Enzyme design. Structure first.
Site, PDB file in Angstrom:
ATOM      1  N   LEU A  38      13.837   8.979  29.805  1.00 30.46           N
ATOM      2  CA  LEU A  38      12.738  10.147  30.238  1.00 30.46           C
ATOM      3  C   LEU A  38      13.098  10.284  31.700  1.00 30.46           C
ATOM      4  CD1 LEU A  38      10.150   8.743  29.044  1.00 30.46           C
ATOM      5  CD2 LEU A  38      10.495  10.197  27.604  1.00 30.46           C
ATOM      6  N   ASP A  39      13.523  11.005  32.782  1.00 37.09           N
ATOM      7  CA  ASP A  39      13.425  11.904  33.733  1.00 37.09           C
ATOM      8  C   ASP A  39      11.950  10.815  34.330  1.00 37.09           C
ATOM      9  OD1 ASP A  39      11.708  13.749  33.873  1.00 37.09           O
ATOM     10  OD2 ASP A  39      12.508  15.200  34.812  1.00 37.09           O
TER      11      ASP A  39
END
Lengths: 82, 56, 97, 72, 95, 49, 486, 69, 663
Positions: A38-39
């Site tokens: 995930l960012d």
């Protein structure tokens, strides 16, 4: 006070209930960017969801510091208002 | 990075313009309705007996 | 030592007091000032008695207190005409003869 | 708290539960009953009711200053 | 109702204090705010003054509209007259 | 407990203050100018009426 | 039971202490306290034998000071000075009780100075001679200056003592000029003759100007109040108690006794001047009390504001105004003494005066918090308190005389309810600052007992002011009636 | 006991600077305006208003206006 | 009996506050509650005796302030109005005491809380049964003090301390106005007794000199008394304290800022009706201020996201309603609405406090949805109270506000038209925000956090017994007391309330108001309910408008933040006063011009002059001989040659030259 096992289970539920997350590869010691991919914005969304579930408010600096499951469980277990 | 910084500044200004007048705050959180309502006693506080006496 | 506990004063201005030259005799001046004080206090107490009977008229008479206590209202308002010593801020319509 | 147990305050303090609070409350009830007697007698002496009530009233048992006042 | 969290350590000054620090209504908490607080931080003081003046001007304009209406000029009933010389003696007139 | 040096004189003077003030003020004749003028005003009003 | 005996009681104790070694600190303390309490009881016995009906001075005693020139010593009371005599005689033992713990460091000179000050105060208030009244008026200058200088906290005590001495000396010197002129004009300094003799309008104006300067040095007005906050800050707690509840009351007493009845036309001519000075002083001093950082400065400026209210209430030449002025004088003496005692307790516990260090004293000093709240209420003049009685009577007189100055004085209510509340909340309410203060102790038995008479006096004079009011109506009426003959 | 406050150097400096403001007066434009407005003009206006109140009382009473300094 | 009524709360409060260490958290609560309950029982007996027996009780103990004619006293006036206020205050105080017993079961300082509650009850009873203006003022500022104390009950809360100080300062401004009014009344009548003042109020019609202005004396006194009533009742001038006074606990808010204290201004205006009836301009000002306050509060309470804030603004709106009901010269209607509002507003506050206590002190409506199922009894109570506040037909609010609107319409005057317009619009807004609060708190789908939903429990027995009694009152008090208080030509009030024959328009309104104008409140209420349903439940554009429209965002902020009135007033006035304390009074004058021209400059000049003088003593024999020679020469010139010297020079010039040489 709220048990650490229940804290772990609820945090894992929050993480697993995510679109870009494979529920199989969720462990109390995973990293958002590294393991489950995930960012930053997904990290802060997960932190906001954790806040909403646990009825607690985190300062912005510590919310940024929360970047992995292990950190999330550690912070929530250390907080006395969980 | 320079135009990134200007974008960040413009976004911060826009957020400051359109932020909620009275944003929700958890009652025990700093600024809530329950903040410092019945705080636990501070540690390292001592009460001294027989403070003022004619003779020691 | 005092004889008994009730005030004995004279209800007459002190003699050998000259209104033209009140400051000629110091004793006469001071006794005249005391007598004037006593007379003003007597007038004040008379006004207080009228006020008390007025308030009890207003309490005894109910809705029809405007006509039953009108005489008492007039009596009190004329009695409070020259009560004060330094009540010059009170309007002359109520404090001047 | 840790240091609040060494602080004497007139109104108990934090979480004041004395062992004999029931006996103390009974004594306080008796004290109220005792102190209210002189106040009640002074009330009955000082009350003035210039108007006779339409109906019989409880105050007619002890208060006697009923219709005894006139503005003269 | 119920015990809460400890307030935390206050601010020990480490830099020279401003010459008006008494205008800082600081508790024993690490979150002090000035004795005079603006409830609406988003709007400026002059903008808030302009908005309040607009509201008061709306009140004054509604009052002026009420004056221009002249409702008393459209009363549907004549003034009531009481018997016995309009209750002169009862109200306190000279008998 | 051992009493302080000031305690005895202070308590004696406090009790003496209470008794002196109460007894003297209650037993003092009501010879005030207000009451004297009230009696005189009552007499004058009775004479006039 | 005489005023000469009342004056001589401090003298005997003072001599006894002078001739006792300093190593017997217990004996010194006990004898000083016993002398003060005996004098207080003697004054109370003088109270239970005071006639409030007559206007003449009650216990007139004559002593041969100068057989010629008519400067014989006259000792007497009439009703106004009497409550001030009682107030000083009651407040002196409180001063000894304050320094009870560390009196060895203070020494017997502390008690001797306070007893000499008591002697001087009783002499001032019991006097029917203008020259001797001035003599003792300026005599009080020595003990207070010595007290402030010797027993001050820090090195600014020197500057505070210098300012106090110079201001009071200048005022007293101009008053001495005026008094000697009056003596030469009349042939005597006797108060009765000075009251029953006329003066020229120009002479009245000049004499009143000199007296006003002298007394306005004492009672803080707009230009000459700046010496008072420093004096209270640098004086010890007992010295501050004396200077707040005794000397300013002396000044306003002297003003009310020798200016209003002696020069009626001059007082009427200068009445708007003191009204505007008092209104300006009240507003400005309350506002500058709002923005203060020192406890002693806050209560000193409150003293300035309330004394200016007193002096705004005297020229309202009516029974309500003058009675309220006297009642608020007594009440403010008590309240200032109590507030300075609270601040002195705080300083003795924690050696600091800034309110930044203080906060959240409810959790550690609940009895002190209750006492401080009650006395801040008294300073605020809450109804049911002596300060409220005095302030409301003063405002009634001011509204009967001049509505504008009455409203300007009543504006002081909002400001006095502001700084008192804000200071009380700062010091007492809130959370503890454990980094600054971490060891605390509540009021002990001695301090609690010291605060007991103040509470009782305030409550008794507020709930039932009838005794104090009726003890002075005759004198107030005669004072207002002095000028006129109608 | 050891009850003395833990004195802060900066707090003490702030207190001393507050109590030593007399050295910083310089008769600047702002100080001159403040002195001339709130030290002269406002007291003069208050005195004039009080004298006006007294004179209005005199006019209402019909007496001759009183003389004041 | 009557001194027992007045002093029973005081005895319990004093004993529980001086011996609370022995009574405890439960003993002190029991004692205060039983003292207040016995006071309420004696108050009901007094109601029977006085109001239902057509009697009147008068008391007097001590002169208190006794002057030549300053006729203060410790009296007690027991009229029908005083007794009605006695019932309201005592019943609400007892119910709030029981509610507090069950509400502060976890709070450490329950004994101190009960002491404060009982002492405020005593102060309010002293206010209500005030024989004269001095006792009324003592009650006024005593209740102000007690409210200040109760607001910062949790003294550790910084904003609670701020709110308490602000509220008591605003009440002090009101007290300044009321004290000016009392002073004017005493100067006019040479008395402060209500009986004498009301008996001789009609005769004086002269002018008055105040602040260099010539005004009518009666109108001036009435205007100052109304200014005093503005602060306590939180009218448009000084209402900023009321919403902020919610920092205190919910029993505090319910007892003080809903029923007893904040209605003291309305009570005083009704009390001084024999004095206010002779000041038509004062009545006009009262009507204008009441209408403006009602509209302002109704608009402000629309966008509040806090239950206590919303109910506080509702209280302010109802107070404005009864205030301009007093200004239509109809005080019997105003007191009736005062009692009804006390009942249902105490109900609303108690129910909201139950919700807040169960929801772990949430207090925010944005996180309170979907509680209708989990709060059956509490939601029922809230619904009953809200319908009463709106004025649902034949409830307790239908018999009070509708007649107020009818009288406002029938008062054919500029002030009457203004009041009617603002009252109708305020009814609309009140319906809107009450139904919005109901929907958000109970019927909107859940928006709260799952933590609070699990542990939510409805009000226990001692929090439900007051609610049931308040619901019964909010049902039947309006109907039962209609003929007693607001009836046609009732002698129930006796002489407590006075209305001039030319100012009575009750029958005119009842028999003249058209049916449409009678039914306007119901139509506005249902329109507001429909608008609330539309805005809250079916709407997906308000947030976008508030985020992309600057005018819409500014309007939302304006209506949310107390009409910006608090911020503007506070900032400008209070900041200017705070700046004056240090920038002008202290630094520019006390430490500036006065000190520079005083001790500082004098010290410097005298130091330099003394130094210069000491420079003369140079230690030279020649210098000393020279000084001797100049002395001799000056003496010779100015005495022996004085004829020509005086013919030539002037003494003023010589001394001026000397001073100029000295600089």
């Amino acid at each position: 006070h709220l048990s650490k096992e229940e804290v772990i289970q609820r945090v894992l539920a929050v993480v697993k209930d995510f679109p870009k997350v494979d529920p199989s590869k969720v462990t109390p010691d995973v990293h958002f960017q590294k393991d489950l991919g995930l960012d930053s914005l997904d990290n802060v969304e997960i932190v906001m969801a954790l806040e909403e579930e646990f009825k607690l408010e985190i300062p912005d600096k510590e919310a940024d510091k929360i970047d992995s499951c292990n950190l999330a469980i550690e912070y929530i277990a250390n907080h006395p208002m969980a | 990075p320079d135009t990134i910084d200007r974008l960040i500044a413009d976004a911060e200004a826009s957020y400051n313009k359109w932020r909620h007048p009275d944003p929700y705050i958890v009652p025990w959180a700093p600024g809530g309705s329950k903040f410092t309502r019945n705080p636990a006693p501070p540690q390292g506080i001592e009460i001294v007996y027989d403070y003022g006496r004619e003779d020691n | 030592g005092r004889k008994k506990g009730y005030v004995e004063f004279d209800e007459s201005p002190p003699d050998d007091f000259d209104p033209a030259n009140p400051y000629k005799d110091p004793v006469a001046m001071l006794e005249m000032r005391e007598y004037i004080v006593r007379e003003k206090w007597i007038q004040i107490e008379k006004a207080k008695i009228i006020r008390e009977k007025l308030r009890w008229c207003y309490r005894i008479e109910g809705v029809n207190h405007l006509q039953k206590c009108r005489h008492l209202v007039n009596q009190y308002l004329e009695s409070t005409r020259g009560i004060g010593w330094g009540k010059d801020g009170r309007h002359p319509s109520l404090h001047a003869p | 708290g840790d240091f609040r147990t060494k602080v004497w305050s007139m109104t108990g303090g934090p979480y004041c539960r004395p062992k004999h609070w029931k006996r103390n409350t009974a004594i306080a009830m008796f004290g109220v009953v005792l102190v209210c007697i002189p106040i009640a007698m002074k009330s009955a002496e000082l009350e003035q009711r210039p108007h006779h009530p339409v109906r019989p009233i409880p105050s007619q048992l002890w208060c006697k200053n009923f219709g005894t006042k006139d503005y003269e | 109702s119920g015990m809460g969290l400890p307030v935390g350590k206050h601010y020990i000054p480490d830099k020279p204090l401003p010459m008006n620090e008494e205008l800082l209504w600081d508790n024993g908490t690490p979150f002090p705010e000035p004795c005079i607080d603006r409830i609406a931080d988003t709007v400026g003081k002059y903008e808030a003054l302009a908005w309040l003046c607009g509201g008061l001007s709306f009140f004054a304009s509604l009052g002026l509209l009420a004056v221009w209406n002249d409702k008393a000029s459209k009363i549907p009933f004549t003034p009531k007259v009481y018997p016995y010389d309009n209750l002169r003696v009862e109200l306190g007139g000279e008998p | 407990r051992k009493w302080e040096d000031w305690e005895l004189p202070c308590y004696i003077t406090s009790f003496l203050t209470i008794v002196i003030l109460g007894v003297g003020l209650n037993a003092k004749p009501d010879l005030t100018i207000e009451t004297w003028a009230h009696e005189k005003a009552l007499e004058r009003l009775k004479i006039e009426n | 039971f005489d005023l000469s005996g009342l004056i001589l009681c401090p003298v005997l104790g003072s001599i006894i202490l002078i001739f006792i070694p300093n190593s017997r600190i217990r004996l010194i303390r006990l004898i000083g306290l016993c002398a003060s309490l005996i004098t207080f009881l003697y004054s109370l016995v003088l109270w239970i034998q005071f006639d409030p009906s007559t206007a003449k001075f009650q216990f007139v005693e004559s002593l041969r000071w100068l057989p010629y020139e008519n400067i014989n010593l006259n000792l007497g009371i009439d009703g106004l000075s009497f409550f001030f005599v009682i107030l000083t005689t009651f407040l002196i033992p409180i001063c000894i009780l304050v320094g009870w713990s560390g009196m060895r460091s203070y020494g017997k000179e502390y008690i001797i100075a306070f007893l000499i000050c008591e002697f001087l105060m009783i002499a001032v208030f019991c006097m029917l001679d203008l020259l001797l009244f001035y003599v003792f008026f300026e005599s009080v200058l020595i003990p207070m200056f010595i007290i402030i200088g010797v027993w001050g906290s820090r090195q600014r005590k020197i500057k505070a003592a210098y300012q106090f001495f110079l201001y009071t000396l200048l005022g007293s010197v101009f008053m001495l000029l005026a008094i000697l002129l009056i003596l030469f004009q009349t042939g005597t300094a006797d108060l009765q003759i000075s009251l029953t003799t006329e003066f020229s309008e120009r002479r009245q104006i000049f004499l009143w100007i000199a007296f006003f300067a002298a007394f306005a040095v004492k009672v803080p007005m707009v230009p000459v109040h700046i010496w008072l906050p420093e004096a209270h800050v640098e004086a010890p707690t007992a010295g501050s108690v004396i200077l707040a509840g005794i000397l300013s009351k002396l000044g306003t007493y002297g003003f009310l006794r020798f200016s209003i009845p002696m020069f009626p036309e001059a007082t009427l001519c200068f009445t708007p001047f003191i009204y505007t000075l008092s209104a300006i002083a009240i507003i400005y001093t309350s506002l500058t009390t709002l923005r203060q950082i020192d406890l002693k400065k806050i209560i000193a400026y409150s003293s300035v504001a309330h004394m200016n209210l007193v002096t705004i209430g005297m020229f309202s030449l009516n029974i309500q105004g003058i009675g309220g002025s006297i009642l608020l004088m007594l009440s403010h003496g008590l309240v200032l003494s109590a507030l300075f005692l609270c601040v002195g307790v705080l300083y003795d516990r924690h050696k600091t005066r800034l309110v930044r260090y203080y906060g959240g004293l409810v959790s550690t000093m609940p009895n002190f918090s209750t006492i401080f709240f009650f006395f801040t209420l008294a300073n605020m003049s809450l109804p049911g308190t002596s300060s409220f009685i005095g302030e409301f009577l003063i405002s009634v007189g001011a509204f009967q005389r001049n509505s504008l100055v009455a409203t300007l004085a009543a504006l002081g209510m909002i400001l006095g309810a502001a700084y008192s509340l804000w200071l009380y909340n700062r010091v007492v309410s809130g959370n503890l600052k454990a980094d600054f203060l971490h060891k605390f102790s509540d009021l002990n038995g001695r301090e609690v007992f010291i605060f007991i008479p103040f509470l009782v006096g305030v409550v008794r004079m507020g709930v039932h002011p009838k005794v104090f009011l009726d003890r002075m109506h005759t004198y107030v009426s005669n004072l207002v009636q002095h000028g006129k003959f109608n | 006991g050891g009850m003395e406050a833990n004195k802060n150097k900066f707090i003490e400096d702030w207190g001393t600077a507050r109590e030593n403001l007399e050295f910083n007066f310089r008769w600047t434009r702002r100080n001159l305006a403040l002195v001339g407005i709130f030290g002269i003009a406002i007291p003069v206006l208050v005195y004039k208003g009080i004298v006006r109140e007294f004179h209005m009382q005199d006019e209402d009473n019909g007496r001759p206006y009183r003389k004041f300094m | 009996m009557y001194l027992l009524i007045v002093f029973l709360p005081l005895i319990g409060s004093s004993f529980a506050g001086f011996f609370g260490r022995f009574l405890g958290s439960e003993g002190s609560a029991i004692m205060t509650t039983t003292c207040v309950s016995f006071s309420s029982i004696l108050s009901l007996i007094a109601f029977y005796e006085v109001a239902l027996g057509a009697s009147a009780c008068y008391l007097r103990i001590a002169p208190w302030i006794s002057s030549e004619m300053f006729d203060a006293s410790w009296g007690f006036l027991f009229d029908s109005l005083t007794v009605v206020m006695l019932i309201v205050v005592t019943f609400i105080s007892s119910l709030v005491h029981l509610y507090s017993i069950s509400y502060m079961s976890e709070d450490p300082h329950s004994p101190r809380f009960m002491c404060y509650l009982s002492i405020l009850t005593f102060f309010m009873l002293m206010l209500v049964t005030g024989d004269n203006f001095l006792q009324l003022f003592l009650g006024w500022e005593g209740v102000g003090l007690a409210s200040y104390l109760l607001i910062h009950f949790w003294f550790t809360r910084l904003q609670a301390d701020k709110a308490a100080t602000k509220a008591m300062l605003v009440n002090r401004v009101g007290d300044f106005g009321l004290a000016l009014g009392i002073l004017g009344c005493f100067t006019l009548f040479q008395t402060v007794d209500f009986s004498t003042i009301f008996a001789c109020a009609s005769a004086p019609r002269n002018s008055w000199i105040r602040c260099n202005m010539r005004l009518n004396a009666i109108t001036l006194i009435c205007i100052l008394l109304f200014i005093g009533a503005v602060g306590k009742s939180a009218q448009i001038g000084s209402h900023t304290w009321l919403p902020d006074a919610m920092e205190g606990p919910t029993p505090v808010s319910a007892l003080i800022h809903a029923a007893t204290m904040v209605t003291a201004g309305v009570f005083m205006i009704a009390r001084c009706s024999p004095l206010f009836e002779y000041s038509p301009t004062a009545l006009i000002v009262i009507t204008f201020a009441g209408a403006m306050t009602s509209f302002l509060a109704a608009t402000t309470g629309i966008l509040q996201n806090d239950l206590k804030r919303v109910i506080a603004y509702s209280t302010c709106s109802q107070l404005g309603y009864m205030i301009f009901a007093c200004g239509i010269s109809n005080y019997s209607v105003s007191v009736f609405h005062l009692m009804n509002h006390a009942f249902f507003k105490a109900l609303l506050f108690l129910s909201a406090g139950s919700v807040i206590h169960a929801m772990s002190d949430e207090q925010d409506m944005r996180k309170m949805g979907g509680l209708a199922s989990s709060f059956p009894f509490t939601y029922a109570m809230m619904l009953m109270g809200s319908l009463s506040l709106i004025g649902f037909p034949f409830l307790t609010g239908f018999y009070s506000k509708d007649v107020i609107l009818e009288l406002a319409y029938t008062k054919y005057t500029i002030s009457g038209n203004f009041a009617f317009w603002l009252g109708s619009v305020s009814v609309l807004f009140t319906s809107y925000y009450s139904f919005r609060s109901l929907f958000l708190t109970f019927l909107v789908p859940t928006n709260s956090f799952g933590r609070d939903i699990l542990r939510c429990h409805d009000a226990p027995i001692p929090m439900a017994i007051p609610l049931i009694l308040l619901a019964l009152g909010s049902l039947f008090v309006g109907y039962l007391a209609k003929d007693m208080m607001i009836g046609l030509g009732t002698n129930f009030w006796a002489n407590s309330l006075f209305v001039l024959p030319k100012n009575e328009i009750l029958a005119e309104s009842e028999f003249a108001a058209p049916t449409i104008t009678k039914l306007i409140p119901i139509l506005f209420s249902t329109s507001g309910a429909s608008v609330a349903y539309n805005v809250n439940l079916v709407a997906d554009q308000f947030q976008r408008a508030f985020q992309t429209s600057t005018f819409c965002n500014r309007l939302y902020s304006f209506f949310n933040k107390r009409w910006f009135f608090d911020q503007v007033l506070n900032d400008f006035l209070v900041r200017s006063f705070l700046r004056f304390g240090y920038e002008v009074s202290f630094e520019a004058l006390d430490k500036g011009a006065i000190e520079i021209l005083g001790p500082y400059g004098i010290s410097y000049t005298f130091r330099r002059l003394a130094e210069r003088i000491s420079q003369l003593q140079s230690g030279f024999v020649y210098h000393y001989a020279f000084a001797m020679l100049l002395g001799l020469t000056l003496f010779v010139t100015f005495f022996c040659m004085w004829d020509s010297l005086s013919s030539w020079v002037d003494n003023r010039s010589s001394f001026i030259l000397i001073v100029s040489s000295f600089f």
